[PDB]
């Protein structure tokens, strides 16, 4: 079973988006008004699930094949790959990376999405994989389209892929969104702008990666993920 | 000062989180193995319990698109981190609110006591992380049990909450669902009876 | 008795810290949500106590001697001195300056401080004095240490000394904190950063003052205090 | 425009304010002369009164580490600035909330009427400045008396508060405590019944 | 026994302090006036002691516990940690790091120190440790205070910790001093300024390291040490 | 050109070096194991010798706060880097000058011959590094022996000193101290008879 | 840090200093009142003495254009600062070396003992400031007396000179000039027997 053998660098909650960001309208009623209560790290916070023994299907990371209903999905074929490291630069191996997204037209395969853009009969929009022993992950997918949403009267999400990363503990677990290099919708989005620091926003923008492309086949984007720094305990209880 | 690489910033999971993390609930086919809300096989050691709850916004309305992750010790106070659908017990699970009733459920065992880093026993608890549309960075909380009053009163984590009235927001209420032992843990994100949320 | 013959320059409440500064967590539930009600200055506001005839003990300003229990306190011996003036540059003579602080290790001599750093048996941490006829005050003390506090999960106050200054009226009375030149904790502190304007923060940083040091004995810091400008009434009720 | 030297910015007094300004309360030895909560000796002219109160935060909880400074006229409506412990009366005093019960007290005389700058009589009042952990710049208020209702109705300062309901927050309630006239003045920093605070 | 199989990069004696730096008064009569005689590296210079099997006491690195006379020392609790590498960036594992310092008030526990600030009965001021397999060392201590000394008529050392590092050979052995980020005494000190190049001075300034702090307990400073680069011999005697 | 990371710059050891590196001398308790001035136990092979010396500044005055580190071959001309207090012989040691008389001592064996990198034999020598208040970067020297005159005359390191008169400064003088062979090696940091110091 | 106005920087007095400060010596007419080398009227209290000396450069050659200012207590240990040619005693005086012999002279009384700021008695001394061509900022020294050995050995200023040999440079030698009590105080600016110079 798990042991308490490490500590995680405290989060910078001015680097992360704050809870109350009123231009993103749903945050107004879904943000705590009381301060968070700080607690010391214990075994409860410094451990978490490892997914090495979860059974992955052969196409779990390949969205071009994992919802196959007689053909290929329509859209810009892309590899999305990168490395998960911690804040000390140490790779995070054998960690769970999950992702979900709309199709090439900005339509989600979810019963609550009523956008008029059609579903793609060969696209589901969900992937998962475990990082390798050096911290690398990769998915194959199509580039999602922007999509309009009922925030302001003419608001559109930039093209984006949702990510969840487990990391070594529940203290490291993160959900975020990947955006694409150069997309002019990025500076306009109130969800992007929930992040106050422009440098933090830049950390969410995947870069075109021609080195990783398959010629005559698919392009590639690179998105590296940094989880909280992990260190050994020192000088505790003395 | 020493500045490390900055952590990747959080974003909301959004209202379609279920596509990626709760496939059934999205209305979609599941894969062979899924991480879900049954932590204990029927013969896992300990007292088998149902946990359930609803999530409220600052207007007192149900948050029908909540996604929750839980982490708890087994009945012997051990954290089982080697996740496997074949395990008798997994310390990790996921759940989500139904869109109709707004109610989540988890099938588990009552966790055993674990010590904090100073060696002081913590009262039995489940660690919870809450994600949803409108929530930019997930909210951490703990579910404790109303039939552990003696332990709760001495818990070094509950004692870090300055006001006793606020400690009460983390105490789940023992009840019965279809005749079976259950505890209800409602979360109020904002306002009257606002649930304590943690940073660590 | 006191008379209504002066007016005090209106406070800039964007130069001062605002009431609600959520990163300083205790401010959330202890800040008014309604606007302050402005009222004209009357004799109630433009007068205040004069402490010329308060009886001071011989060591009241000298924290190296005013908690003597058989020895000298441990820590960096310093003089803290400066001038109290008003916004027009006029000295504020015979005014009460009070101060309190932690010991060299960041421990306060207060029942509610349970920080693990030890008390110093020869340090109490409280001083007071009256400014002289030219507006100058002086204390001798030990430089206080930083100290951790339950705000965020790893927050530390910079080394600081708390100050209270009466001035000529209850309108000028001020409580503040002195910080020390170059302290890398200053930019990180949510209490410091309750002040929005970086130039205002600089006004709280005491400067090393080698000119005022006693060689082979103690260093010195200089901290000048500016109270609201005082003027005569003019053209009122006509 | 003309820009003067900027005023030194305020900071919170913090939770250990007592060690500098309320020595007893910190758990500490006092000096020969201390500025404290007895404004009037038995022999001062005027009606001798006890003032008491509790301070509440926005969640309705006691602020147990409040520090208060008060400034009031003598029974003649004159402010006495020459502070001296030998005086039968001083216009200035200090008090603090008990950490246990959260109550402060003051022993004084009821102040006489003073005119505003325009020559209009103000109802009898005590000027209060409130400091504490969490308060970045002290809050100014006035304590008026419920046995002065006719005067209060005409006070030009109370009449600057636009809503009559908010004026009620400044009116202390008369009682009898061990056979002496007393008034309770509770302060609510935030929320329901929030006390009016002034800028001047 | 040791072998001659490495060479060490020649020292830059304009990066180091020169011998004669007259503002540091004791250097005047203790500096050679003749040039140093250069000699080629032989086994005498390129070897040195390895202290892997020196016996360390359990508290040798922990100045909060290694002079325990009934309590904790008074002062700012800190970890001082860092890595020893060579000029090529290679870690220097299992190397001896020794340190000594004054107490919180600038008083040394040495018969020849008569500064009036008191000794601390629970502080001795000496530490040692061996770097780990990856070149890292750690001490726990109290931040030392500045202290006055008989150089000029009002000279004060900045807060500092003395360090000695063995390295792989007697050619790499180094004694230096650590100073603390932001200390306004640093630019004023004639011992600091024995180093002519301001960039070299910056290499001695330890940085506040909040990532390595123990919340509610102790702060941390980071101080990395660079020893002479080590290379294999090549093309010698041919 | 290729620029590596710069080396950490040296600073003086200062006058309290003893507290860190010569514990006894500071007036302080020692730890269980200390690195000190006895390189050889009675049972080490070779000729057992006492070394002693005083250190002078440029005005001819004793340096009473010197700290010295020494490194020498064993009697076979081999360097022993595995430092252990259990060893009959260690190649490394430390000593310091008495504050009173200014003399340091070392107990060791006479080192054997070692070749330079070019295979030419060096005369027997002890490598010395000298630290003190006033010395910003330690001074390197060698102690050779006056009973090795023929070897010294051919030493390729001594022959790098251009002037024969300066070579004499590195030659320790043999004496007898309580019936044991000893050598005096005095160091003059500056001026008349200035000791040769090396860079390497 | 706090930076005051910088002091006006020193420059050499140059070789024609006598024009301004030693008019006779320049070869020029004097004014009615001049500040010169007779500190004591013949009937001033105390032991009347002649002081004289020569000043040497680092080559052992006379500095024939020296200008000296002196400041000393009177015989009762009092500093007489109200300079007046009518005073029995002036604590201040000036002198200069003759260009031929290089010798300065001063006519005074032996100073009484004064305490340092800690209340410790200083041995009888004259404070001297030396100016000349080649001297960019004047040199401070003190002249003590060889017949005050007991006092000199205990002087808290002489004891700040680390080496006893250097203390000897400040001790003037009792002698007789034309049969009268005198003390000779030679100053060596540089080199062998270099006079101690002070900063304060
Ligand atoms: Fe989305
Ligand atoms: Fe404080
Ligand atoms: Fe030092
Ligand atoms: Fe000239």
Question: SS3 letters for B110-177?
Answer: CCCCCECCCCCECCCCEEEEEECCCCCCCEEEEEEECCCHHHHHHCCCHHHCCCHHHHHHHEEEEEEE
CA of C178 to nearest chain B CA: how many angstroms apart? 21
Q: Which residues contact C169 (CB under 8 A, 6 or more apart)?
A: C6, C8, C45, C46, C47, C48, C230
Of the listed ligands, the closest to the CA of C125 is 2
Q: Which residues contact C226 (CB under 8 A, 6 or more apart)?
A: C84, C85, C86, C87, C203, D5, D6, D7, D8
Beta bridge partners of C26: none
The answer to whether the annotation marks G133 as part of a ligand binding site is yes
H-run or E-run covering F151: helix F149-153
Q: Exposed, middle or buried by CB within 10 Å (0-12, 13-18, 19+), for D184?
A: middle
Interface test with A, best of C153, C190, C194 (most A CBs within 10 A): C153
Cα–Cα separations (whole angstroms), residue F68 to E175, F52, F199: 12, 11, 17
Beta bridge partners of B177: B180
Of A196, C159, C41, the closest CA to residue E184 belongs to: C159
Chains adjacent to E (≥3 CB pairs closer than 8 angstroms): A, B, C, F, G
Q: Does the active-site annotation cover E162?
A: yes
Give CA–CA dist E185/E192, Å, rounded.
10
Is the torsion defined by CA of D22, D24, D27, D29 positive or negative?
positive
CA of E55 to nearest chain F CA: how many angstroms apart? 6
Give CA–CA dist E130/C68, Å, rounded.
42
Q: Is the Cβ pair G160, E188 closer than 8 Å?
A: no
- By C-alpha distance, the chain G residue nearest C224 is G2
* CA atoms within a 13 Å half-sphere pointing along the CA-CB vector of C88: 9
Q: F-chain residues within 8 Å CB-CB of G165? A: 59, 61
CA of D113 to nearest chain C CA: how many angstroms apart? 11
- As residues whose CB is below 5 A from the ion ligand 3, the structure lists F 14
CATH topology of domain C1-238: Protocatechuate 3,4-Dioxygenase, subunit A (2.60.130)
Interface test with F, best of G161, G162, G163 (most F CBs within 10 A): G163
Q: Does E138 touch chain A (CB under 8 A)?
A: yes
Are F124 and F171 spatial neighbours (Cβ–Cβ below 8 Å)?
no
Domains of chain F (ranges, CATH numbers): 1-200 (2.60.130.10)
CA of B114 to nearest chain C CA: how many angstroms apart? 21
Give CA–CA dist D151/D122, Å, rounded.
8
Are A75 and A120 spatial neighbours (Cβ–Cβ below 8 Å)?
yes
Q: Which residues contact A174 (CB under 8 A, 6 or more apart)?
A: A163, A164, A165, A167, A225, A227, B7, B8, B10
Beta bridge partners of G68: G95, G130
CA of C224 to nearest chain B CA: how many angstroms apart? 28
Question: Which of A35, A39, A40 is closest, CB to CB, to C22?
Answer: A35
* Resolution of the solved structure (Å): 1.7
Of the listed ligands, the closest to the CA of B16 is 1
Which of E147, E179, E221, E228 is catalytic? The answer is E147
Of the listed ligands, the closest to the CA of E176 is 3
Are C149 and C110 spatial neighbours (Cβ–Cβ below 8 Å)?
no
DSSP per-residue codes, E97-157 = EEEE---TTS--SSTT---SSPP-TT---EEEEE--TTSEEEEEEEPPPPEEESSSTTEEE
Is the torsion defined by CA of E141, E147, E150, E152 positive or negative?
positive
Q: Does A124 touch chain B (CB under 8 A)?
A: yes
H-run or E-run covering G26: helix G23-26
- As residues whose CB is below 5 A from the ion ligand 2, the structure lists D 14
Q: Count of H helices and E strands in chain G? A: 4, 9
- By C-alpha distance, the chain B residue nearest C187 is B1
Cα–Cα separations (whole angstroms), residue C173 to C45, C139, C228, D140: 11, 20, 9, 11
Of B85, B66, B35, the closest CA to residue A126 belongs to: B35
The token duo for G191 is 């080199």
Q: Which residues contact B15 (CB under 8 A, 6 or more apart)?
A: A110, A112, B65, B132, B133
Give CA–CA dist G39/G108, Å, rounded.
5
Q: Is the Cβ pair D71, C44 closer than 8 Å?
A: yes
- By C-alpha distance, the chain E residue nearest G199 is E153
Interface test with E, best of G3, G159, G161, G199 (most E CBs within 10 A): G199
Composition of chain B by helix, strand, coil, percent to 5: 10, 30, 55
Locus of tokens 């000193």:
F161
Q: Does B4 touch chain E (CB under 8 A)?
A: yes
Give CA–CA dist A75/A143, Å, rounded.
7
Q: Provide the 3-class DSSP secondary structure of residue G178.
A: coil
Of F156, F136, F148, the closest CA to residue F172 belongs to: F148
- Residues of each annotated binding site of D for 3,4-dihydroxybenzoate: 133
Q: Does G5 touch chain C (CB under 8 A)?
A: no
H helix runs in chain A, sequence order: 43-46, 198-202
The token duo for A195 is 């992040």
Are C30 and D58 spatial neighbours (Cβ–Cβ below 8 Å)?
yes
Give CA–CA dist G83/G69, Å, rounded.
14
**Which C residues in the span 139-158 are in contact with D, Cβ-Cβ below 8 Å?**
none
Are F198 and F140 spatial neighbours (Cβ–Cβ below 8 Å)?
yes
Q: Provide the 3-class DSSP secondary structure of residue G58.
A: coil
Give CA–CA dist E190/F11, Å, rounded.
11
* Residues shown for chain G: 200
Q: Which residues contact F148 (CB under 8 A, 6 or more apart)?
A: F123, F124
Q: Does the active-site annotation cover E221?
A: no
* Local structure of residue E108 (DSSP, 8 states): -
Of D90, D107, D116, D127, the closest CA to residue D47 belongs to: D107
Cα(F12) to ligand 3 centroid in Å equals: 9
Q: Does B1 touch chain E (CB under 8 A)?
A: yes
The token duo for G190 is 């540089």
Cα(A25) to ligand 1 centroid in Å equals: 15
Locus of tokens 């705590």:
A32
Q: Is the Cβ pair A33, B190 closer than 8 Å?
A: yes
Give CA–CA dist C217/E115, Å, rounded.
8
Q: Which residues contact D50 (CB under 8 A, 6 or more apart)?
A: D105, D106, D107, D177, D180, D181, D182, D183
Which of E16, E109, E162, E222 is catalytic? The answer is E162
What is the SS3 assignment for F119-139? Answer: CCEECCCEEEEEECCCCCCCE
Q: Provide the 3-class DSSP secondary structure of residue F146.
A: helix
Task: Return the domain boundaries, chain A.
Answer: 1-238
């Amino acid at each position: 079973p798990a042991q308490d053998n490490s500590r995680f660098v405290i989060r910078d909650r001015n680097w992360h988006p704050k809870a109350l960001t009123p231009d993103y309208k749903t945050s107004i009623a879904r943000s705590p008004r009381q301060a968070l209560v700080s607690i010391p790290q214990s075994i409860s916070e410094t451990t978490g699930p490892n997914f090495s023994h979860l059974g992955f299907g052969a196409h779990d990371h390949d969205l071009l094949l994992n919802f196959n209903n007689g053909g290929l999905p329509i859209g810009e074929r892309i590899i999305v790959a990168g490395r998960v490291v911690d804040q000390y630069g140490k790779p995070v191996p054998n960690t769970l990376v999950e992702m979900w997204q709309a199709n090439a037209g900005g339509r989600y395969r979810h019963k609550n999405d009523r956008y008029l853009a059609p579903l793609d009969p060969n696209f589901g929009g969900v992937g998962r994989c475990l990082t390798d022993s050096d911290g690398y992950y990769s998915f194959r997918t199509i580039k999602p389209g922007p999509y309009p949403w009922r925030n302001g009267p003419n608001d559109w999400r930039p093209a984006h892929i949702h990510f969840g990363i487990s990391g070594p503990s529940i203290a490291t677990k993160l959900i975020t969104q990947l955006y694409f290099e150069g997309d002019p919708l990025i500076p306009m989005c109130p969800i992007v702008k929930s992040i106050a620091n422009p440098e933090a926003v830049q950390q969410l923008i995947a870069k075109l990666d021609m080195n990783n492309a398959n010629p005559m086949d698919c392009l590639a984007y690179r998105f590296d993920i940094v989880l909280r720094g992990q260190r050994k305990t020192h000088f505790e209880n003395c | 000062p020493i500045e490390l690489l900055p952590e990747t910033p959080s974003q909301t999971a959004g209202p379609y989180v279920h596509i990626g993390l709760a496939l059934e609930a999205a209305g979609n086919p599941t894969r062979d193995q899924e991480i879900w809300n049954r932590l204990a096989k029927p013969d896992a050691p300990g007292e088998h319990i149902l946990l359930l709850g609803q999530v409220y916004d600052g207007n007192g309305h149900l948050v029908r698109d909540s996604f929750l992750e839980v982490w708890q010790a087994d009945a012997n106070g051990e954290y089982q981190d080697a996740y496997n659908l074949e395990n008798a017990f997994n310390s990790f699970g996921r759940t989500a609110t139904t869109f109709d009733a707004g109610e989540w459920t988890l099938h588990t065992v009552k966790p055993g006591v674990v010590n904090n880093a100073a060696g002081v026993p913590m009262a039995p608890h489940i660690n919870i992380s809450l994600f949803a549309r409108g929530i930019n960075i997930h909210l951490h909380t703990r579910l404790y049990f109303d039939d552990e009053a003696q332990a709760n009163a001495k818990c070094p984590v509950l004692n870090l909450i300055e006001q006793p009235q606020r400690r009460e927001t983390l105490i789940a209420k023992r009840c019965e669902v279809d005749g079976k032992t259950a505890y209800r843990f409602d979360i109020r994100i904002q306002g009257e009876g606002e649930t304590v949320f943690f940073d660590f």
